[PDB]
Design an enzyme around this catalytic site. Sequence first.
Site, PDB file in Angstrom:
ATOM      1  CG  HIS D 202       6.626   3.780  -0.869  1.00 22.84           C
ATOM      2  ND1 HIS D 202       8.012   4.533  -0.774  1.00 22.84           N
ATOM      3  CD2 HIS D 202       7.043   2.547  -0.162  1.00 22.84           C
ATOM      4  CE1 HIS D 202       8.890   3.871  -0.415  1.00 22.84           C
ATOM      5  NE2 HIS D 202       8.595   2.772  -0.112  1.00 22.84           N
ATOM      6  CB  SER D 206       0.045   3.105   6.400  1.00 21.39           C
ATOM      7  OG  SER D 206       0.378   2.311   4.907  1.00 21.39           O
ATOM      8  CE  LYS D 228      -0.021  -7.779  11.178  1.00 22.36           C
ATOM      9  NZ  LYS D 228      -0.609  -8.378  12.278  1.00 22.36           N
ATOM     10  CG  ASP D 229       1.189  -8.168   3.760  1.00 23.80           C
ATOM     11  OD1 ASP D 229       0.174  -7.715   4.155  1.00 23.80           O
ATOM     12  OD2 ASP D 229       2.001  -7.330   2.980  1.00 23.80           O
ATOM     13  CD  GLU D 272     -22.460 -12.219  -8.981  1.00 20.28           C
ATOM     14  OE1 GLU D 272     -23.408 -12.880  -9.764  1.00 20.28           O
ATOM     15  OE2 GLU D 272     -22.538 -12.773  -7.755  1.00 20.28           O
TER      16      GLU D 272
HETATM   17  C1  HEM Z   1      -9.355  -2.006  -5.488  1.00 20.26           C
HETATM   18  C2  HEM Z   1      -8.005  -1.549  -5.447  1.00 20.26           C
HETATM   19  C3  HEM Z   1      -7.014  -1.079  -4.717  1.00 20.26           C
HETATM   20  C4  HEM Z   1      -5.913  -1.691  -4.425  1.00 20.26           C
HETATM   21  C5  HEM Z   1      -4.944  -2.714  -5.220  1.00 20.26           C
HETATM   22  C6  HEM Z   1      -5.247  -0.825  -3.238  1.00 20.26           C
HETATM   23  C7  HEM Z   1      -4.171  -1.037  -2.855  1.00 20.26           C
HETATM   24  C8  HEM Z   1      -3.812  -0.401  -1.540  1.00 20.26           C
HETATM   25  C9  HEM Z   1      -2.618  -0.762  -0.757  1.00 20.26           C
HETATM   26  C10 HEM Z   1      -1.578  -1.873  -1.228  1.00 20.26           C
HETATM   27  C11 HEM Z   1      -2.590  -0.090   0.419  1.00 20.26           C
HETATM   28  C12 HEM Z   1      -1.689  -0.038   1.574  1.00 20.26           C
HETATM   29  C13 HEM Z   1      -2.320  -0.584   2.679  1.00 20.26           C
HETATM   30  C14 HEM Z   1      -1.447  -0.393   3.849  1.00 20.26           C
HETATM   31  O1  HEM Z   1      -0.974   0.826   4.123  1.00 20.26           O
HETATM   32  O2  HEM Z   1      -0.918  -1.425   4.402  1.00 20.26           O
HETATM   33  C15 HEM Z   1      -3.952   0.810   0.190  1.00 20.26           C
HETATM   34  C16 HEM Z   1      -4.082   1.591   1.191  1.00 20.26           C
HETATM   35  C17 HEM Z   1      -5.062   2.662   1.136  1.00 20.26           C
HETATM   36  N1  HEM Z   1      -6.035   2.378   0.097  1.00 20.26           N
HETATM   37 FE1  HEM Z   1      -6.195   1.286  -1.403  1.00 20.26          FE
HETATM   38  N2  HEM Z   1      -6.226   0.144  -3.081  1.00 20.26           N
HETATM   39  C18 HEM Z   1      -7.439  -0.146  -3.656  1.00 20.26           C
HETATM   40  C19 HEM Z   1      -8.683   0.583  -3.652  1.00 20.26           C
HETATM   41  C20 HEM Z   1      -8.833   1.688  -3.009  1.00 20.26           C
HETATM   42  C21 HEM Z   1     -10.113   2.618  -2.821  1.00 20.26           C
HETATM   43  C22 HEM Z   1     -11.415   2.289  -3.801  1.00 20.26           C
HETATM   44  C23 HEM Z   1      -9.941   3.357  -1.878  1.00 20.26           C
HETATM   45  C24 HEM Z   1     -11.045   4.509  -1.675  1.00 20.26           C
HETATM   46  C25 HEM Z   1     -11.384   5.162  -2.318  1.00 20.26           C
HETATM   47  C26 HEM Z   1      -8.684   3.219  -1.230  1.00 20.26           C
HETATM   48  C27 HEM Z   1      -8.089   3.928  -0.214  1.00 20.26           C
HETATM   49  C28 HEM Z   1      -7.214   3.556   0.457  1.00 20.26           C
HETATM   50  C29 HEM Z   1      -6.549   4.168   1.829  1.00 20.26           C
HETATM   51  C30 HEM Z   1      -7.250   5.393   2.425  1.00 20.26           C
HETATM   52  C31 HEM Z   1      -5.501   3.526   2.291  1.00 20.26           C
HETATM   53  C32 HEM Z   1      -4.730   3.938   3.397  1.00 20.26           C
HETATM   54  C33 HEM Z   1      -5.100   2.848   4.458  1.00 20.26           C
HETATM   55  C34 HEM Z   1      -4.231   3.474   5.890  1.00 20.26           C
HETATM   56  O3  HEM Z   1      -3.371   4.082   5.830  1.00 20.26           O
HETATM   57  O4  HEM Z   1      -4.931   3.006   6.838  1.00 20.26           O
HETATM   58  N3  HEM Z   1      -7.881   2.245  -1.883  1.00 20.26           N
HETATM   59  N4  HEM Z   1      -4.307   0.490  -0.966  1.00 20.26           N
HETATM   60  C1  LIG Z   2       3.686   0.309   0.325  1.00 15.96           C
HETATM   61  O1  LIG Z   2       4.064  -0.808   1.079  1.00 15.96           O
HETATM   62  C2  LIG Z   2       3.548  -1.599   0.338  1.00 15.96           C
HETATM   63  C3  LIG Z   2       4.569  -2.286  -0.440  1.00 15.96           C
HETATM   64  O2  LIG Z   2       5.847  -1.915  -0.535  1.00 15.96           O
HETATM   65  C4  LIG Z   2       4.276  -3.678  -1.161  1.00 15.96           C
HETATM   66  C5  LIG Z   2       5.109  -4.137  -2.053  1.00 15.96           C
HETATM   67  C6  LIG Z   2       2.807  -3.789  -1.169  1.00 15.96           C
HETATM   68  C7  LIG Z   2       2.514  -5.000  -1.972  1.00 15.96           C
HETATM   69  C8  LIG Z   2       1.806  -4.684  -3.318  1.00 15.96           C
HETATM   70  C9  LIG Z   2       1.515  -5.550  -4.225  1.00 15.96           C
HETATM   71  C10 LIG Z   2       1.698  -6.881  -4.194  1.00 15.96           C
HETATM   72  C11 LIG Z   2       1.107  -4.807  -5.580  1.00 15.96           C
HETATM   73  C12 LIG Z   2       2.144  -4.958  -6.695  1.00 15.96           C
HETATM   74  C13 LIG Z   2       1.486  -5.517  -7.900  1.00 15.96           C
HETATM   75  C14 LIG Z   2       1.686  -5.051  -9.142  1.00 15.96           C
HETATM   76  C15 LIG Z   2       2.981  -4.169  -9.197  1.00 15.96           C
HETATM   77  C16 LIG Z   2       1.132  -5.753 -10.433  1.00 15.96           C
HETATM   78  C17 LIG Z   2       2.240  -5.784 -11.397  1.00 15.96           C
HETATM   79  C18 LIG Z   2       2.275  -7.309 -12.104  1.00 15.96           C
HETATM   80  C19 LIG Z   2       1.424  -7.478 -13.513  1.00 15.96           C
HETATM   81  C20 LIG Z   2       1.110  -6.297 -14.122  1.00 15.96           C
HETATM   82  C21 LIG Z   2       1.767  -8.784 -13.987  1.00 15.96           C
HETATM   83  C22 LIG Z   2       2.804  -9.774 -13.583  1.00 15.96           C
HETATM   84  C23 LIG Z   2       3.617 -10.150 -14.608  1.00 15.96           C
HETATM   85  C24 LIG Z   2       4.212 -11.255 -14.802  1.00 15.96           C
HETATM   86  C25 LIG Z   2       3.989 -12.029 -13.422  1.00 15.96           C
HETATM   87  C26 LIG Z   2       4.844 -11.801 -15.966  1.00 15.96           C
HETATM   88  C27 LIG Z   2       4.853 -13.497 -16.014  1.00 15.96           C
HETATM   89  C28 LIG Z   2       3.280 -13.876 -16.711  1.00 15.96           C
HETATM   90  C29 LIG Z   2       3.181 -14.256 -17.815  1.00 15.96           C
HETATM   91  C30 LIG Z   2       1.998 -14.938 -18.129  1.00 15.96           C
HETATM   92  C31 LIG Z   2       4.436 -15.092 -18.573  1.00 15.96           C
HETATM   93  C32 LIG Z   2       4.953 -16.437 -17.969  1.00 15.96           C
HETATM   94  C33 LIG Z   2       4.568 -17.490 -18.988  1.00 15.96           C
HETATM   95  C34 LIG Z   2       5.254 -18.075 -19.526  1.00 15.96           C
HETATM   96  C35 LIG Z   2       4.893 -19.242 -20.638  1.00 15.96           C
HETATM   97  C36 LIG Z   2       6.839 -18.253 -18.761  1.00 15.96           C
HETATM   98  C37 LIG Z   2       2.000  -3.202  -0.268  1.00 15.96           C
HETATM   99  O3  LIG Z   2       0.540  -3.810  -0.255  1.00 15.96           O
HETATM  100  C38 LIG Z   2       2.456  -2.284   0.468  1.00 15.96           C
HETATM  101  O4  LIG Z   2       1.560  -1.561   1.398  1.00 15.96           O
HETATM  102  C39 LIG Z   2       1.747  -2.283   2.558  1.00 15.96           C
END
Ligand code: HEM
Ligand SMILES: COc1c(O)c(C)c(C/C=C(\C)CC/C=C(\C)CC/C=C(\C)CC/C=C(\C)CC/C=C(/C)CCC=C(C)C)c(O)c1OC
EC number: 7.1.1.8
Lengths: 126, 248, 385, 385, 93, 93, 57
Positions: D202, D206, D228-229, D272
């Site tokens: 952020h 991207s 799209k998401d 696995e």
């Molecule tokens: C498995 C855990 C990961 C999560 C939850 C995660 C999450 C994200 C998210 C939300 C984005 C935004 C995508 C976009 O820009 O629309 C992103 C982009 C990106 N991630 Fe991750 N990521 C993970 C692992 C990785 C790994 C292992 C790498 C490599 C070392 C990586 C490299 C990148 C890069 C390079 C981008 C930019 C893509 C672009 O701008 O074209 N990510 N990631």
């Molecule tokens: C930068 O542009 C963005 C962007 O702005 C966003 C938002 C996303 C989307 C990102 C995400 C969806 C990832 C965010 C995820 C987290 C921050 C994970 C955090 C969540 C947790 C750690 C767990 C969540 C916790 C709960 C839901 C609490 C509730 C759970 C329980 C068990 C309590 C309920 C139980 C009872 C009995 C009520 C992008 O992928 C992205 O790139 C395109």
Amino acid sequence: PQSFTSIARIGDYILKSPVLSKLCVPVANQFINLAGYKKLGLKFDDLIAEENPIMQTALRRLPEDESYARAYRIIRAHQTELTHHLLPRNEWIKAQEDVPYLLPYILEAEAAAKEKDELDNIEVSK
Amino acid sequence: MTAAEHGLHAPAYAWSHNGPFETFDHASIRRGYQVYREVCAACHSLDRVAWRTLVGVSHTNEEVRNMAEEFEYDDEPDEQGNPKKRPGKLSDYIPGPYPNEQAARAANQGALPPDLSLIVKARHGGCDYIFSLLTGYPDEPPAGVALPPGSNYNPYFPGGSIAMARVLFDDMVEYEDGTPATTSQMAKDVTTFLNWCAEPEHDERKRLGLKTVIILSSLYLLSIWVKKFKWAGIKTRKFVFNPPKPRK
Amino acid sequence: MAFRKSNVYLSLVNSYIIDSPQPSSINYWWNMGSLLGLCLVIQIVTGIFMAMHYSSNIELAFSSVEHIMRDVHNGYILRYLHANGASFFFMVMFMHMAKGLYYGSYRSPRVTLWNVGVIIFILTIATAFLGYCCVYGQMSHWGATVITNLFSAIPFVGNDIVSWLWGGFSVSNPTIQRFFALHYLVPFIIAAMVIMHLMALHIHGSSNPLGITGNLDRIPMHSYFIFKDLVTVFLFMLILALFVFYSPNTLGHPDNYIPGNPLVTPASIVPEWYLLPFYAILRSIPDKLLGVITMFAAILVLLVLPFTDRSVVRGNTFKVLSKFFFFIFVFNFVLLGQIGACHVEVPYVLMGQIATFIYFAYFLIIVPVISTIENVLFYIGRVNK
Amino acid sequence: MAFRKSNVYLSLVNSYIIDSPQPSSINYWWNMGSLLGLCLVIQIVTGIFMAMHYSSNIELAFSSVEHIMRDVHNGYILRYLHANGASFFFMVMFMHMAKGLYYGSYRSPRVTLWNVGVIIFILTIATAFLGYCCVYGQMSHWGATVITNLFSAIPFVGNDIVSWLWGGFSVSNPTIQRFFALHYLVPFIIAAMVIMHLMALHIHGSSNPLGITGNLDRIPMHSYFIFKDLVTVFLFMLILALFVFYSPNTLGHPDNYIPGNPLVTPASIVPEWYLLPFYAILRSIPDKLLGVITMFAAILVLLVLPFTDRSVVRGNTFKVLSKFFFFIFVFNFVLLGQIGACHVEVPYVLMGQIATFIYFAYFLIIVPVISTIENVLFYIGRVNK
Amino acid sequence: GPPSGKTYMGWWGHMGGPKQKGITSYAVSPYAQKPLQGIFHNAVFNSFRRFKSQFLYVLIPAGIYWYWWKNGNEYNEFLYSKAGREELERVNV
Amino acid sequence: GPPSGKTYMGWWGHMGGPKQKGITSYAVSPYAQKPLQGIFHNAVFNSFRRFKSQFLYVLIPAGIYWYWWKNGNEYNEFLYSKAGREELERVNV
Amino acid sequence: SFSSLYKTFFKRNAVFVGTIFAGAFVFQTVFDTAITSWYENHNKGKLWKDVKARIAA
Ligand code: HEM
Ligand SMILES: COc1c(O)c(C)c(C/C=C(\C)CC/C=C(\C)CC/C=C(\C)CC/C=C(\C)CC/C=C(/C)CCC=C(C)C)c(O)c1OC
Ligand SMILES: CCCCCCCCCCCCCCCCCC(=O)O[C@@H](COC(=O)CCCCCCCCCCCCCCC)COP(=O)(O)OC[C@H](O)CO
Ligand code: HEM
Ligand code: HEM
Ligand code: HEM
Ligand code: HEM
Ligand SMILES: COc1c(O)c(C)c(C/C=C(\C)CC/C=C(\C)CC/C=C(/C)CC/C=C(\C)CC/C=C(\C)CCC=C(C)C)c(O)c1OC
């Protein structure tokens, strides 16, 4: 939050009532000079909260001399309280030097804002 | 509430294990073990602690193994599935005459014997509470109180009646000295042993606590000095107000 | 933009830890809040270690707690630290609330912070009860059943909700397992909401004991306040060491140390010391559902505490009647705790009801009127013409 | 300024979720990252709900999942979704890494993102291997022994660390308790570093499929990319549900549903599917510590790629043959995994060394020479003198 | 980075407080001082002065509530002592 | 909030892209569009073009690695089908 | 009294951390030994060291 106009109304009600004012003015000034802010070299206007926007509007109209003196008094109070000390009876605010220099601006701003918000939401009923 | 069953507080006695710079008098815990096992064997359970903590503080190396060999611990069945009997180990738990609990409630003619492994902290007061409970009861109840047939009395204990058989008669302990045969010595022995069983870490706890309080006191004084040091340049700065010239 | 502030990861720490403009008039009461946070995280980490070395099944729950007590190196220390940390956590929470209330820090600039703190308290008393349930002694599950019966007082439905929450008409593995899981989970919500609390704090700044503006002078927190926090936490750790080593099981009550046996309750049953005033507020009002709702009203009255104090001057240092009545209030609170500690008989019930009445009357009535009197006296005394 | 941007929590939500100037050439590959994040979140949630009715005892671990299957309502759903979501998380993670590699997402403004991603990769290697070690099946004990004895080759310290991991001098209750504790805890570390990853992204934004600046046209995140998401996650949920409900024995291996007993076991023991690429490479060079150091090399090659190639044009879409060699590499990756699936024998054992050599050679020697050749070909083509 | 919300206090250079002139400070290094120059005078005189100042608002409520608690305790003790069979029946009605 | 460090992009209004002037865009209010009419034909043509631009990049590497795996397997049948008795010796020695 | 011999020792930074940590380790070891010895010699007879000789004949 409490309107200063109501305070002025109650004050003028008390001040022109002979027996009640004669009973309540000596205890009033005794409470004022036992409050303790006099010793720290504070005027009363420096104590009332200055956060909500109406107080900011009142502050922005103060002449520069009063604002400078107020800033110095706040800084000196902070420094004095940091050491838990009190300077001797030389910086102490005299009995008649605690005059409100900020009341008229507060009253004018209160009246203006109150009538503005009253006439903004108004009806055309007779 | 009403002091009749609230329980009057026992006076704070003086022990060997109530103080800041003390240890257990575990020269008598080797005697507390005997006083417990000779009379309280078929009375309670105490089955919560093992024998690995009974070596080095109450018995040195061998009598624990003699005790282990003395009793049978119901070993695993053989290849035929038949039950057998085996000597005990040095990592087992103190057994009891009852199989698990059944033989207790049948013979007590009443309630169940509470597990003595935690009675030291199970009641208010503490070390002196059990001493007062086992000492202060007279042989005859207060005038006008007719207890249920077959029940004794104890004024210190809130409740005024227990299923305890008053097995505290003297003159039949006599280890190797003249110490026993008086209630005070055996009472002190049993209360110290029960305290040790409830907390087998008093010496180590106090040593670690002494080290910790020393190090934290040093650190606290150090922080005092340094805070008074590096705040000296900010706690002494002085302000002087010179009114500005009158021109906006 | 030096390396410390240009790099975003280091810039986040720079805005919070390395450089943050706190005022120079801070007393020893705000490092108490920092100490609250640090003892909270200490409780979290020792809880993690326990969960690493703890089993929650009924056939082994007491077995697990006595094994971590006895059959592991540095084990009993963990339990003692848990108990003393919980007690100190609630004590320091009460001190934090007292500091917030006395110095007028609930006012307009940080009202949002005040509600965040209030809801933190509302759910942390719950999580404290839930942790109290996890012991599974002769009084822990006993109080858990007490609270379930209390919650069963919801109108218009009595059986379905209590059966769903309490896992049927009996207690088995799912009930205690879910209770332990939720006592494990709720402190994570505590951590998240505390993160929100710190965000709001950093946005809106901090107040002063003088009850006046603090923007005139400011100093960085690092190299000036970090060592004050260090000395206050060293003092706290010395006190905690004294209560964990020499006399560990003193703040707690000698009732939890009984194996699981909900057959015969012990003669003396009392709640933990951080819950006695609320037990009193429940006992005073002679109604079950109304007692529950008045407990909740006593808990939530801090929400309606703002926009009720019409004292123009922030804080309570320069006003004498208000702080006198505040001291009356705090002594009434401790008296309520003490009377809740003892039993219910004549004439304790009458003065307990009087205490609850003056508590609620204090909040809802007396501070507005005495503050109005203070303001009018302030106006009249200064003006002599 | 609107109240949506005024409130601090709402302002952060708007600036980080609702409003984000994303590029206008985004394909489904970029939504794959958000899909993976949602998969991670749902995996954490279902794992938490699984552990609530779970027992950490060594003999009550397999019995615990058995009790979940046969006694609790909808017990199969939680574990099936957990396992299949883990496998899908790993596959989509490989897809995300490949998409980052092919489109030149490793350039200068995103080196921090690459580093945090590869750190997540390093930890993710074991965060599920130990989770599989938890179940204590018929190859789980073997996997635990492999991971606990890989580190024994370090000189002058070979027994102390393995003894700490063993909780003793062998595999017993401490091993499984520690395994469960860490498999529970370290996903929270994953959460921490993925918050860091999203924060860095952020901050920097991207990239574009074209490889040119995307600071010309942008559209807000809400109402444009949320759809799209949403469609991507709907497709993912559909396929995942169809597999979990209709073909349970497809992603996972039917080897762990047998109690741990080193008495009778078949020879069809193989880890696995997602382990195979980083497993065949270990069996090429014939030494003990050599395997560990070449795992280190195979996980550091993903890190050496920045400032290694000499492609001034970002990406591989507009390069004549570099994409062909990238496809050679991806098919070599697949074939290396598949040949690692097969047991050791001629010529597969001989194939191992050559496959590993190609796998490393693309990373080391192929990229710089191919980039320089492509650049000089562009320069000679564009100009005539 | 969009600007944050309008707040009275901000970062260095924009405290938001009134513009002031004529204030002069005088600091000096802690190295050229005695760090505990006046600890005894403080901890005796200033501590006693602050205690005397606060000695008009704290002890009165504590004393009155202590009297209330003690009177309740005396009433409780007297009720269940040679009066429980004649006085305690006419108080529980 | 507080200003950040060096960055290649900003927020709305001050993103930081190159200065440009003379570009006009349009829109047709997607409500009054009836968007999709030839979706199947559009998909067919797009798939045809995408396949046309990428003949070899998918066909060649997969084919060569299939040939390599086939060579390995056929060597295996030359060895591992009732024939290892007279070639495992020369493989292993 | 702070001669150049002691003045020179207050300039090294890269290597001072290791030796200061080693000095801390030595100090904690000797402090632990001293506290153990004092806890030993503050209580005789009660401890288990001399009960071996007490029971010995
Ligand atoms: C498995 C855990 C990961 C999560 C939850 C995660 C999450 C994200 C998210 C939300 C984005 C935004 C995508 C976009 O820009 O629309 C992103 C982009 C990106 N991630 Fe991750 N990521 C993970 C692992 C990785 C790994 C292992 C790498 C490599 C070392 C990586 C490299 C990148 C890069 C390079 C981008 C930019 C893509 C672009 O701008 O074209 N990510 N990631
Ligand atoms: C930068 O542009 C963005 C962007 O702005 C966003 C938002 C996303 C989307 C990102 C995400 C969806 C990832 C965010 C995820 C987290 C921050 C994970 C955090 C969540 C947790 C750690 C767990 C969540 C916790 C709960 C839901 C609490 C509730 C759970 C329980 C068990 C309590 C309920 C139980 C009872 C009995 C009520 C992008 O992928 C992205 O790139 C395109
Ligand atoms: C019989 C008890 C013996 C205790 C022995 C151990 C503790 C020794 C403490 C130091 C020796 C005593 C010196 C005389 C009392 C000093 C009190 C005092 O006010 O001095 C300083 C106190 O130093 C501190 O910072 C103390 C922090 C107090 C923390 C909060 C209060 C807790 C209770 C403190 C006293 C008890 C401490 C031990 C409790 C077990 C100055 O305060 P300051 O540094 O904050 O500066 C403020 C201003 O400049 C005034 O001059
Ligand atoms: C040998 C000497 C004994 C000792 C030192 C001893 C000790 C104790 C103690 C400490 C208690 C609990 C006291 C308290 O409330 O804290 C107790 C209770 C009890 N004991 Fe003993 N005991 C002895 C003998 C016996 C015997 C012989 C029996 C009968 C077989 C017995 C049966 C019980 C029972 C039933 C209780 C529980 C009473 C109740 O639940 O009301 N005890 N004993
Ligand atoms: C600030 C948060 C917490 C508070 C106030 C708190 C409070 C308590 C209290 C009062 C007890 C009773 C123990 C006793 O009386 O001996 C307890 C027990 C326990 N708590 Fe917490 N707790 C907190 C957080 C946690 C966390 C995060 C865990 C993580 C697993 C945890 C796990 C346990 C366990 C396992 C026990 C029972 C062990 C024992 O009885 O010794 N607690 N807690
Ligand atoms: C329980 C976890 C809490 C933590 C970690 C925490 C932390 C903090 C911190 C760091 C501050 C800044 C000043 C200081 O350091 O004390 C603060 C201030 C404050 N907190 Fe909390 N707090 C907590 C709970 C609460 C609760 C429950 C309330 C509800 C009454 C509350 C109300 C306040 C108020 C009114 C301030 C203003 C102090 C100032 O003027 O800056 N806090 N808190
Ligand atoms: C997001 C990262 C995770 C991954 C990749 C993962 C992976 C796995 C896998 C593969 C299995 C079964 C082994 C097999 O069938 O192959 C499993 C089981 C399990 N996981 Fe995870 N898991 C993750 C996180 C979690 C979390 C956060 C929890 C929280 C409680 C959890 C709790 C469990 C439980 C209770 C089981 C049942 C079997 C066992 O004891 O291992 N997992 N996990
Ligand atoms: C008002 O002025 C301020 C101020 O502005 C700030 C920011 C602070 C700073 C605030 C705090 C210090 C309190 C913040 C509290 C937290 C951040 C709580 C942290 C909560 C956590 C759960 C910590 C997270 C850590 C982990 C999850 C890692 C722990 C796990 C471990 C160690 C695994 C161990 C296992 C192995 C195998 C090693 C102040 O103290 C302060 O007053 C001066």
